[PDB]
């Protein structure tokens, strides 16, 4: 038995689990009783097992808004029900050979360690961000992290790009803005020198200096991109689509800004007018509440070339031949999905890993551009238009496509039989089988 403990609510861990099963391990997804009550189980090859966060009949994420507070409930109950799961499973003849866990849950580690269960930390943020947090946790870097700090890592051949003030990860560049996430980001690495394995959802051709440093400093092994095999061309394992089928090749701007507060739906009006003014066909994901908040006049303007939808099969949209670029907040999973499909990016980072990923996208990978905010931090329609035309029509357009395609090929190769990430996956599985 391999146990998989992602933060409760995933895909990347489960995809790693699917490859463990291919090599003959038996994976179990471990999640809350709530998730398990409500959501359907992953199905074969997975079993599921349930712990508790204190909240078996209601989301405690809702019931406890503050960051610090939810975590303590989850820990208190989770640590205890996890301990019982392990002991139960052991007594049941199904002892856990290894616990793969999100190190945003460092108590997973102590529970497993206490029961003699090997631990494998699963980092699903890019090496470049993980390493900065690590350096802070090891006290080789002092809060706050500054562009100067970053330029030192760059000079030392650890970071492949020079990060400015809008590129450093804000959780440690501006700790005071978000102290709980700051702490948690850094703490992932306290006690990670004790893990039997450390795994990162990236690939080494993507971030070669950063992945080499993570490997030599934390023994981190790249196991990504951890996505469904189909999209990596690996054979060993709806209205918007009908709309995409009618579009010309490489023409559509996929757009996912993410969640917007009431404090700004002016933002969405800027975004939507920018889209209309670009003149490109566009598929814009806006959740239904937020759509009802758009102006009548913006909705009519969007009818001409756009389709607004509450959700889409993002990976399938990105693989469709109609899709020409992705205006994204540049979350990591989203970004790897774009890479693997060879889609240029227009990056609108908000937080967490996004600023740093966006800098990589623009300045090392060369697969798109990042939107420039004004003095007040606002994204204007003119900037949205400009970025779209820059990627889809400008003089550098073929550079963005060529670079994305280059990264798509190395992504696929890394995960195919015999690639760098596939080898790390196979070594990990031979270790526990
Ligand atoms: O309409 C949507 C919005 C998101 N996702 C998926 O949800 C995951 C994470 O979404 P988010 O947009 O927060 O991006 P991340 O921040 O994880 O990169 C990714 O695998 C997306 O493919 C999707 O399939 N359809
Ligand atoms: C309670 C809680 C929710 C968080 O949301 C943001 C993001 O959506 C994922 C997470 C990593 C996040 C979930 O992992 C964080 O770890 C956390 O502790 C977070 C800090 O970056």
From Swiss-Prot:
The keyword Glycosyltransferase applies. Induction: Induced by exposition to gamma ray. It holds the Pfam family UDPGT. UDP-alpha-D-glucose binds at residues 124, 259, 311-312, 329, 332-334, 337, 353-354. Its EC number is 2.4.1.-. CDD domains: GT1_Gtf-like. Belongs to the UDP-glycosyltransferase family. This is UDP-glycosyltransferase 79. The lineage of its organism: Eukaryota, Viridiplantae, Streptophyta, Embryophyta, Tracheophyta. The gene is UGT79.
């Amino acid at each position: 038995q391999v146990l998989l403990l992602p933060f409760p609510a995933t895909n990347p861990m489960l995809q790693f689990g699917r490859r463990l099963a291919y090599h003959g391990l038996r994976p179990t997804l471990v999640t809350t009783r709530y998730v398990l009550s409500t959501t359907p189980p992953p199905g074969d090859p997975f079993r599921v097992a349930a712990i508790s966060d204190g909240f078996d009949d209601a989301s405690g994420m809702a019931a406890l808004p503050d960051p610090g507070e939810y975590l303590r409930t989850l820990e208190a109950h989770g640590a205890r029900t996890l301990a019982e799961l392990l002991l139960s499973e052991a007594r049941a003849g199904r002892p856990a050979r290894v616990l793969v866990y999100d190190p945003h849950l460092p108590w997973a580690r102590r529970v497993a360690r206490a029961a003699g269960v090997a631990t494998a930390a699963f980092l699903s943020q890019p090496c470049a961000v993980d390493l900065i947090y690590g350096e802070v946790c090891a006290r080789r870097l002092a809060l706050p992290v500054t562009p100067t700090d970053a330029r030192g890592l760059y000079a030392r051949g650890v970071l492949g790009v020079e990060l400015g003030p809008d590129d450093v990860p804000p959780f440690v560049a501006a700790p005071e803005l978000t102290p709980a996430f700051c702490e948690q980001s850094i703490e992932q690495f306290a006690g990670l020198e004790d893990d039997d394995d450390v795994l990162v959802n990236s690939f080494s051709d993507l971030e070669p200096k950063e992945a080499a440093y993570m490997e030599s400093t934390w023994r981190a092994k790249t196991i990504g991109p951890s996505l469904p095999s189909f999209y990596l061309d690996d054979g060993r394992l709806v209205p918007c689509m009908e709309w995409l089928d009618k579009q010309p090749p490489r023409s559509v701007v996929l757009v996912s800004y993410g969640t917007v507060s009431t404090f700004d739906v002016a933002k969405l009006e800027e975004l939507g007018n920018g889209l209309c003014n670009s003149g490109k066909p566009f598929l814009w994901v806006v959740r239904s509440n937020e759509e009802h908040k758009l102006s009548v006049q913006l909705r009519k303007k969007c009818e001409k070339r756009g389709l607004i939808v509450p959700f889409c099969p993002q990976l399938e949209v990105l693989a469709h031949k109609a899709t020409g670029c992705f205006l994204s907040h540049c979350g990591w999973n989203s970004t790897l999905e774009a890479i693997v499909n060879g889609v240029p990016l227009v990056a609108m980072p908000h937080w967490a890993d996004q600023p740093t990923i966006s800098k990589y996208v623009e300045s090392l990978w060369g697969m798109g551009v990042r939107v420039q905010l004004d003095k007040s931090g606002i994204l204007q329609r003119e900037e949205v238009e400009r970025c779209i035309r820059e990627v889809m029509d400008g003089d550098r357009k073929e550079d963005y496509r060529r670079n994305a395609t280059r990264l798509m090929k190395k992504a696929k190769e890394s995960m195919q039989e015999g690639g760098s990430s596939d080898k790390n996956i196979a070594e990990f599985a031979a270790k526990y089988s």
